[PDB]
Amino acid sequence: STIEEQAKTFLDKFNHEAEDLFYQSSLASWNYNTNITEENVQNMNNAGDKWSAFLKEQSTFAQYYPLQEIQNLTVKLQLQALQQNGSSVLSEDKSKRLNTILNTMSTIYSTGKVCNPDNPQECLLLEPGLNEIMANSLDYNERLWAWESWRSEVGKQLRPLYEEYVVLKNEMARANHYEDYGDYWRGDYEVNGVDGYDYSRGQLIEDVEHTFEEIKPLYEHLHAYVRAKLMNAYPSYISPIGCLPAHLLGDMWGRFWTNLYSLTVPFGQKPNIDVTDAMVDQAWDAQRIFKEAEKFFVSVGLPNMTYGFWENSMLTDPGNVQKAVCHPTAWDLGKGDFRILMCTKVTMDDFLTAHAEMGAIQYDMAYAAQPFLLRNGANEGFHEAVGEIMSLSAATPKHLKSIGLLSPDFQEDNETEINFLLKQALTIVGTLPFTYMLEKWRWMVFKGEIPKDQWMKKWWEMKREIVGVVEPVPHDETYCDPASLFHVSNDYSFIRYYTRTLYQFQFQEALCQAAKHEGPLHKCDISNSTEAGQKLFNMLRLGKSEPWTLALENVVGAKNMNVRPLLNYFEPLFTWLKDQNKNSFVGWSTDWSPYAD
Amino acid sequence: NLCPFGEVFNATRFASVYAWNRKRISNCVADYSVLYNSASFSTFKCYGVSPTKLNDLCFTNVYADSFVIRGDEVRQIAPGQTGKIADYNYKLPDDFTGCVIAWNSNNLDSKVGGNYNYLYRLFRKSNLKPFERDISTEIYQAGSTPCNGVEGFNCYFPLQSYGFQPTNGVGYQPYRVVVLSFELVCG
Ligand SMILES: *[C@@H]1O[C@H](CO)[C@@H](O)[C@H](O)[C@H]1NC(C)=O
Ligand SMILES: *[C@@H]1O[C@H](CO)[C@@H](O)[C@H](O)[C@H]1NC(C)=O
Ligand SMILES: *[C@@H]1O[C@H](CO)[C@@H](O)[C@H](O)[C@H]1NC(C)=O
Ligand SMILES: *[C@@H]1O[C@H](CO)[C@@H](O)[C@H](O)[C@H]1NC(C)=O
Ligand SMILES: *[C@@H]1O[C@H](CO)[C@@H](O)[C@H](O)[C@H]1NC(C)=O
Ligand SMILES: *[C@@H]1O[C@H](CO)[C@@H](O)[C@H](O)[C@H]1NC(C)=O
Ligand SMILES: [Zn+2]
Numbered sequence: 001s002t003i004e005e006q007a008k009t010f011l012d013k014f015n016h017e018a019e020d021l022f023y024q025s026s027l028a029s030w031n032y033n034t035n036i037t038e039e040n041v042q043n044m045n046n047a048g049d050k051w052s053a054f055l056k057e058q059s060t061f062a063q064y065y066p067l068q069e070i071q072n073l074t075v076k077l078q079l080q081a082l083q084q085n086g087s088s089v090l091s092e093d094k095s096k097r098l099n100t101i102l103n104t105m106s107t108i109y110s111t112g113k114v115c116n117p118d119n120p121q122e123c124l125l126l127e128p129g130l131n132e133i134m135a136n137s138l139d140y141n142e143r144l145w146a147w148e149s150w151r152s153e154v155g156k157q158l159r160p161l162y163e164e165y166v167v168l169k170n171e172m173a174r175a176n177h178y179e180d181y182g183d184y185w186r187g188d189y190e191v192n193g194v195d196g197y198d199y200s201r202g203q204l205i206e207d208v209e210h211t212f213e214e215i216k217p218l219y220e221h222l223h224a225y226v227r228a229k230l231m232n233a234y235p236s237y238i239s240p241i242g243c244l245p246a247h248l249l250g251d252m253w254g255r256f257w258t259n260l261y262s263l264t265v266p267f268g269q270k271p272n273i274d275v276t277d278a279m280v281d282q283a284w285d286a287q288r289i290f291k292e293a294e295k296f297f298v299s300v301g302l303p304n305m306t307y308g309f310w311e312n313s314m315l316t317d318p319g320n321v322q323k324a325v326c327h328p329t330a331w332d333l334g335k336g337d338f339r340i341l342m343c344t345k346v347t348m349d350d351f352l353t354a355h356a357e358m359g360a361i362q363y364d365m366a367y368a369a370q371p372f373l374l375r376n377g378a379n380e381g382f383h384e385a386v387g388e389i390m391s392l393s394a395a396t397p398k399h400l401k402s403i404g405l406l407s408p409d410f411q412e413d414n415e416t417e418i419n420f421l422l423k424q425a426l427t428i429v430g431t432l433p434f435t436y437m438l439e440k441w442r443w444m445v446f447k448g449e450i451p452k453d454q455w456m457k458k459w460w461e462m463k464r465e466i467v468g469v470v471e472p473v474p475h476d477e478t479y480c481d482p483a484s485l486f487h488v489s490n491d492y493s494f495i496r497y498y499t500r501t502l503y504q505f506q507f508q509e510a511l512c513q514a515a516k517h518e519g520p521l522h523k524c525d526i527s528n529s530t531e532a533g534q535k536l537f538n539m540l541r542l543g544k545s546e547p548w549t550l551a552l553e554n555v556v557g558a559k560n561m562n563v564r565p566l567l568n569y570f571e572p573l574f575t576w577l578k579d580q581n582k583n584s585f586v587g588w589s590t591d592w593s594p595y596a597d
Numbered sequence: 598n599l600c601p602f603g604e605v606f607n608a609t610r611f612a613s614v615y616a617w618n619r620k621r622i623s624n625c626v627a628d629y630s631v632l633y634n635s636a637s638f639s640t641f642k643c644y645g646v647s648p649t650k651l652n653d654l655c656f657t658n659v660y661a662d663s664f665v666i667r668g669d670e671v672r673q674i675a676p677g678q679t680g681k682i683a684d685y686n687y688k689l690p691d692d693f694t695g696c697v698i699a700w701n702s703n704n705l706d707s708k709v710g711g712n713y714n715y716l717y718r719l720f721r722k723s724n725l726k727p728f729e730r731d732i733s734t735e736i737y738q739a740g741s742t743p744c745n746g747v748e749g750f751n752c753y754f755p756l757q758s759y760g761f762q763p764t765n766g767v768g769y770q771p772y773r774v775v776v777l778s779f780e781l782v783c784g
Contacts, residue, residue, distance in 0.1 A: 001741065006739055009739045
């Protein structure tokens with residue numbers, strides 16, 4: 001019995017027993033979400049405790065098999081994922097500490113309550129309500145209160161708890177043999193043992209840094225153009241050279257500038273490309289939205305969402321009776337079960353979000369015929385990029401004609417493309433500085449470059465410099481603004497939200513070439529192109545069996561992250577934005593302040 | 598007289614795949630027409646004889662092998678399909694004269710929380726010969742260490758249970774299978 005043949009029969013036992021265990025724990029995790037209840041939360045913990053406990057024993061047995069003297073490449077990768085020590089190294093209740101503080105963080109957001117001073121009854125959560133203030137209100141005073149009170153009341157509360165979060169999770173450092181908690185999340189991109197393709201964790205920094213510099217030209221001009229529109233709609237508050245205030249951006253944090261499309265509309269007399277005003281006039285419920293999404297991909301080639309999807313998914317808000325997490329989540333349970341949980345709304349954003357999550361489902365479906373561990377896409381950015389590759393096609397003005405939202409006229413004017421591109425830039429271009437900034441400060445925290453006595457404050461200097469956004473009110477370190485966002489509170493990577501972005505244009509370029517599109521990339525619908533769909537499914541199935549740097553090359557010529565497709569997609573917008581912003585100042589001052597007055 | 602096909606197909610319970618029940622059907626008249634015209638069966642692959650031809654065809658002896666397997670594995674109840682089930686549980690002769698009948702049992706053999714009753718052999722030192730039922734629950738020794746009849750390193754219980762939750766996908770839902778063979782009983 002060769003050691004690899006012993007390794008396969010061990011792995012063969014794992015894939016059978018683990019799939020049911022993962023399904024059982026994931027089934028309770030769905031129920032916890034659907035019917036938030038002390039009993040359901042406990043069911044997730046006890047069943048989830050078994051999944052973790054099951055993982056630890058198989059992990060110890062996997063170490064007995066050496067990572068050497070095995071040759072089938074899938075066998076090596078499968079063994080590494082199991083052989084990782086994991087969160088077991090922390091001694092007993094110390095791990096339970098990490099469980100409790102993290103378990104607290106899911107609750108603090110769900111229970112995070114800001115209360116109106118005028119009416120002490122009237123307290124709000126980060127339900128759609130608070131986010132709706134940031135999305136629609138045009139009052140500087142109103143937005144600031146929701147911006148401030150949230151992290152005044154709830155942020156500070158999480159500051160000691162996020163303080164121990166790093167302290168206790170960086171205990172893993174040199175226990176799990178990674179140097180800092182930033183090194184662990186970067187291990188997702190790591191590929192080793194492949195000649196000519198070995199990608200080290202440090203390469204990801206240098207790559208991100210270089211591509212971001214080429215992103216800066218387009219972003220600064222967008223930042224300038226947005227400032228001019230904002231200064232008219234907000235006299236006095238905004239200085240023509242100063243950093244943009246955070247609350248007047250779309251979200252509670254400013255992650256997506258797509259909310260400001262109404263204020264920042266280039267032309268506005270031509271037909272609207274934001275078709276939420278048409279969806280309400282086209283009476284499209286959530287079932288219609290997803291049914292049109294299901295129809296999009298079956299046109300490409302993937303068959304229908306399994307009936308277990310439509311039967312067991314939650315695509316509508318429960319109502320008052322049931323309290324559930326409303327965040328878009330492309331759940332995948334294994335054992336042939338695929339569901340989507342997403343409180344859905346009558347908005348183009350929710351129309352475009354649904355198309356991305358279903359593309360992620362069909363990703364989760366395409367590589368089902370793989371060993372258990374290799375079924376998670378080849379890196380984190382892939383899973384999040386596949387859906388947006390389709391989403392870029394979904395919003396295209398030509399495809400919006402076929403859906404029935406834009407009228408049959410289709411004015412293909414030189415202006416409508418810019419209207420469409422700027423809505424796309426706000427959603428796509430704006431989030432990349434915010435992403436790099438957040439994760440840069442996150443990585444630097446794990447390394448220890450910023451002590452707690454310099455925390456928070458540094459965050460704001462970095463946010464002023466990189467993203468060009470200023471704080472309305474100065475914050476002591478008792479404030480904890482970074483952990484006002486779900487991705488930071490629930491210990492989820494956020495740079496995975498930027499690798500996908502450079503990726504999402506890398507692939508579409510090749511998919512349009514596969515469809516033999518005659519023209520630019522923003523004119524590209526993957527619809528009715530069986531060949532481009534076969535190209536995706538051919539490499540969706542690979543999962544993590546083939547290194548990402550290899551799977552990238554097979555689809556698109558590049559073996560690594562390249563910003564060049566993104567620039568080409570935005571090149572018409574970049575040239576126009578330069579001409580308009582010739583008088584206004586491009587750039588910002590790191591020293592301006594809305595409170596220094 | 599009416600062949601007792603009713604109790605084989607309408608049984609309250611079906612046996613596991615590693616111990617497939619065999620019921621002898623002999624000296625009775627059998628209407629095969631109800632089977633190929635029931636419309637309640639997903640798979641009905643008669644490998645040797647056409648169902649039309651065997652309706653009036655007398656036969657020496659009939660036996661019914663009934664077991665429950667996964668739908669992904671229904672492919673394997675077939676001459677020369679390999680795979681785990683045919684390899685270590687139930688293999689067909691590859692000269693097989695007979696029929697394979699299958700229908701979904703998600704309504705009956707799947708329950709909330711999952712049913713773990715059905716078992717399948719996962720490890721076997723040597724591939725099963727046609728029509729050989731093995732129920733040896735001896736730890737498959739995978740390495741150099743001897744298992745001494747207890748679980749341990751490279752010492753796995755050769756039996757693993759199916760999990761059947763109703764929300765599973767079609768490829769993972771439980772399917773009820775009845776295998777019919779003919780030897781050389783009319784209609
Ligand atoms: C709500 O949770 C309770 C758990 O006690 C359950 O009885 C009820 O069915 C749940 N509601 C659902 C599943 O819609
Ligand atoms: C931690 O990892 C080491 C790697 O050499 C392994 O030997 C050890 O068993 C692991 N600890 C466990 C599984 O508790
Ligand atoms: C080795 O080849 C493939 C690599 O994709 C692997 O999936 C399979 O399990 C291995 N085959 C055997 C059993 O030798
Ligand atoms: C796919 O699903 C749609 C949903 O209505 C259905 O109309 C269509 O006929 C199905 N196509 C298949 C099964 O090929
Ligand atoms: C794809 O084809 C269908 C039917 O041929 C058509 O209704 C739809 O408009 C097409 N989509 C395009 C051209 O984007
Ligand atoms: C639209 O086209 C006109 C005329 O060709 C030209 O000024 C420019 O490209 C566009 N005008 C805008 C964007 O205001
Ligand atoms: Zn998200």
